[PDB]
Design a protein around this ligand. Structure first.
Ligand SMILES: [Cl-]
Ligand SMILES: [Cl-]
Ligand SMILES: [Cl-]
Ligand SMILES: [K+]
Ligand code: NA
Length: 129
């Protein structure tokens, strides 16, 4: 599913991401924009053999099981395919664990390089929330 900007903002808010770990909703929407362009079916293969999945490009080295990342963990206790669903519940629940892991949203390199420090409120501007 390819979400609209305000549609995704509303879904993220319903699942408790707004201000989670102190990160406003615009931070999460901005991260999703540059990780996946709002597409739940986005995937990206990494040089180390791991793969990133879903609207927040969550990685199989630590967070989900795909059966093809030797030595990896599955800290969100889900198949990576669950991160590709049209329903964002699994991605949100796993993102909550990731952002609590110590480095906040710096866990998403694209957030650090493209959202951090910017006017992230623009990403929810105009949305009925
Ligand atoms: Cl915001
Ligand atoms: Cl497996
Ligand atoms: Cl980047
Ligand atoms: K594996
Ligand atoms: Na894994």
């Amino acid at each position: 599913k390819v979400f609209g900007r305000c549609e995704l903002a509303a879904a993220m808010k319903r699942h408790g991401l707004d201000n989670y770990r102190g990160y406003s909703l615009g931070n999460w929407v901005c991260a999703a924009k540059f990780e996946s362009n709002f597409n739940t079916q986005a995937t990206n293969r990494n040089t180390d053999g791991s793969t990133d999945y879903g609207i927040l490009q969550i990685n199989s080295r630590w967070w989900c099981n795909d059966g093809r990342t030797p030595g990896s963990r599955n800290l969100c206790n889900i198949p990576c395919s669950a991160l590709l669903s049209s329903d964002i519940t699994a991605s949100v629940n796993c993102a909550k664990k990731i952002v609590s892991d110590g480095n906040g949203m710096n866990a998403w390199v694209a957030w650090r390089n493209r959202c951090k420090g910017t006017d992230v409120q623009a990403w929810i501007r105009g949305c009925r929330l």
